[PDB]
Amino acid sequence: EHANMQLQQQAVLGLNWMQDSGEYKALAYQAYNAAKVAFDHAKVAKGKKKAVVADLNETMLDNSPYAGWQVQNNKPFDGKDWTRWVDARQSRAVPGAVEFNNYVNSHNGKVFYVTNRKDSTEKSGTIDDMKRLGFNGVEESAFYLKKDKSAKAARFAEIEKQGYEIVLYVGDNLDDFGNTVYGKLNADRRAFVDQNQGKFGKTFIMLPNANYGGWEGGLAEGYFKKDTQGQIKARLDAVQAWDGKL
Amino acid sequence: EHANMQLQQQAVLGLNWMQDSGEYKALAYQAYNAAKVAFDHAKVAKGKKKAVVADLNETMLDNSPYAGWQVQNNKPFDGKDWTRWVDARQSRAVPGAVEFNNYVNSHNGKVFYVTNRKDSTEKSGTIDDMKRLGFNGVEESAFYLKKDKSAKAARFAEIEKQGYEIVLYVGDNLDDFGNTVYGKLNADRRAFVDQNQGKFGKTFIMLPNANYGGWEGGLAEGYFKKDTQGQIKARLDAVQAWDGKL
Numbered sequence: 001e002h003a004n005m006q007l008q009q010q011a012v013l014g015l016n017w018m019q020d021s022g023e024y025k026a027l028a029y030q031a032y033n034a035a036k037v038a039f040d041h042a043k044v045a046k047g048k049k050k051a052v053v054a055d056l057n058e059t060m061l062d063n064s065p066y067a068g069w070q071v072q073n074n075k076p077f078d079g080k081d082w083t084r085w086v087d088a089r090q091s092r093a094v095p096g097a098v099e100f101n102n103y104v105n106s107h108n109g110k111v112f113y114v115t116n117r118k119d120s121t122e123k124s125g126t127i128d129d130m131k132r133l134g135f136n137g138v139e140e141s142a143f144y145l146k147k148d149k150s151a152k153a154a155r156f157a158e159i160e161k162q163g164y165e166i167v168l169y170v171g172d173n174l175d176d177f178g179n180t181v182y183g184k185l186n187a188d189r190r191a192f193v194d195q196n197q198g199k200f201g202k203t204f205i206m207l208p209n210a211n212y213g214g215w216e217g218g219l220a221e222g223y224f225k226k227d228t229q230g231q232i233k234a235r236l237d238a239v240q241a242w243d244g245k246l
Numbered sequence: 247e248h249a250n251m252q253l254q255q256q257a258v259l260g261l262n263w264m265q266d267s268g269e270y271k272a273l274a275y276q277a278y279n280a281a282k283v284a285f286d287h288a289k290v291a292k293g294k295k296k297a298v299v300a301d302l303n304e305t306m307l308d309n310s311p312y313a314g315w316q317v318q319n320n321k322p323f324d325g326k327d328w329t330r331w332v333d334a335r336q337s338r339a340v341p342g343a344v345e346f347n348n349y350v351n352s353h354n355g356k357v358f359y360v361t362n363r364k365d366s367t368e369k370s371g372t373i374d375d376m377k378r379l380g381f382n383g384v385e386e387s388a389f390y391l392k393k394d395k396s397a398k399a400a401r402f403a404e405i406e407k408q409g410y411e412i413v414l415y416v417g418d419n420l421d422d423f424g425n426t427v428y429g430k431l432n433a434d435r436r437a438f439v440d441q442n443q444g445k446f447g448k449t450f451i452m453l454p455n456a457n458y459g460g461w462e463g464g465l466a467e468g469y470f471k472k473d474t475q476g477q478i479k480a481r482l483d484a485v486q487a488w489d490g491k492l
């Protein structure tokens with residue numbers, strides 16, 4: 001129980017930032033302002049329909065109250081708890097997301113939700129929240145929720161097989177742009193970003209998430225297979241510190 | 247000493263994100279890609295020179311190793327320690343910052359560094375680091391370091407009085423865009439962002455900083471006047487949590 005409190009306390013400052021700061025809101029607006037510009041500029045091959053692919057969690061939907069519950073109950077992430085959160089139907093919208101979504105859908109485009117919320121158990125709550133939140137276009141066929149694989153490239157391909165050309169991707173996780181660094185450590189993930197420097201803010205649109213993600217598992221080999229104590233040490237070992245001298 | 251460790255442990259996860267994640271790098275590239283587009287589009291009044299205003303800390307310069315030192319030594323922020331860090335000359339560059347800086351300066355623009363690093367004690371180390379890092383245009387006159395006031399609007403005005411029109415602002419803190427929410431709590435700061443939604447990614451360019459900022463003081467009245475214990479409670483009280491029920 002000591003390790004659990006320590007692990008979740010380490011998330012507090014970043015959670016305050018995501019939940020309370022105007023700075024976070026500004027970053028969300030910045031991403032979606034850029035996304036609209038990219039969508040408007042996009043041209044697709046003859047015969048293709050324009051598609052935008054968007055992740056949900058921490059991209060279009062704000063699940064910060066779940067993180068707040070982890071902090072307050074010293075609870076590390078558990079898929080069983082997550083499913084209850086989804087069923088709770090208290091998701092909020094990331095600033096600018098609804099407007100951008102609805103703009104795309106009313107301007108000769110279609111947003112597809114490629115998300116790792118679970119198709120079997122988490123679909124009903126997701127669709128309910130998004131309708132309440134004001135998203136247009138949330139019929140079941142717009143959703144590619146998780147079934148067998150967490151990697152998303154196969155779903156992107158399903159979308160292209162339906163006659164769409166994907167003009168841009170929106171996400172908070174690099175794995176939202178393809179599979180090339182799925183399950184990889186942060187060194188490789190940073191290298192992927194470097195190799196794609198010019199796409200960010202154009203065809204790859206980023207939202208900030210300092211609370212969780214592929215970068216967490218990226219902190220150390222077999223991070224998620226570690227116990228709570230091992231994860232704390234992984235985080236602290238990853239820290240780069242000034243030695244305090246000149 | 248117990249409170250000090252707790253306070254700084256709360257920063258760990260967000261520090262891992264800023265230091266290690268490819269996601270953070272992608273956000274930095276996204277901001278600077280957008281900044282170049284805005285700079286290229288900008289037109290100024292007749293007779294004016296084009297200026298870009300940029301903050302340094304966590305906007306163009308990466309001081310994360312200082313934060314890492316705080317974590318490892320259970321040290322809350324202290325201006326005396328900060329000055330030593332600056333003097334240490336180990337600052338790194340935020341991804342994309344040098345290239346954008348040098349592009350502006352070679353394309354009929356001038357970047358001015360409006361920064362709260364201290365003009366008297368922290369200028370020499372700043373200029374030394376920026377030269378090493380590859381920034382062009384780091385003569386003393388490009389810098390508007392802190393003298394008497396932390397609020398930046400007066401410095402922006404000094405720049406305009408020199409015959410420049412400021413075409414865009416780059417920062418990680420909303421106070422980097424003006425004084426309207428300086429010293430204000432987060433509710434007012436979010437409202438400022440909402441009232442300027444369309445400027446973000448255009449004339450106000452944001453970099454992510456989940457480690458510190460005006461949003462921290464924004465968590466509670468007289469936050470920085472609080473003792474370590476009071477600040478921990480301020481952070482935890484600001485948390486919004488799911489109740490765990492449906």
Ligand SMILES: Nc1ncnc2c1ncn2[C@@H]1O[C@H](CO)[C@@H](O)[C@H]1OP(=O)(O)O
Binds near residue numbers: 055082116118173212
């Ligand atoms: N703290 C956390 N750790 C892991 N996954 C989280 C999480 N918070 C929310 N999630 C979501 O829970 C599911 C399991 O990882 C994913 O859908 C993920 O969102 P994602 O779809 O955006 O990746």
Ligand SMILES: Nc1ncnc2c1ncn2[C@@H]1O[C@H](CO)[C@@H](O)[C@H]1OP(=O)(O)O
Binds near residue numbers: 304323362419
């Ligand atoms: N953790 C922290 N808390 C307060 N200021 C910090 C800080 N880390 C770096 N700084 C910098 O230290 C000075 C005092 O606040 C400012 O120059 C600020 O950067 P800034 O100029 O970007 O605002």
Ligand SMILES: [Mg+2]
Binds near residue numbers: 055057059172173
């Ligand atoms: Mg996500």
Ligand SMILES: [Mg+2]
Binds near residue numbers: 301302303305417418
């Ligand atoms: Mg700054």
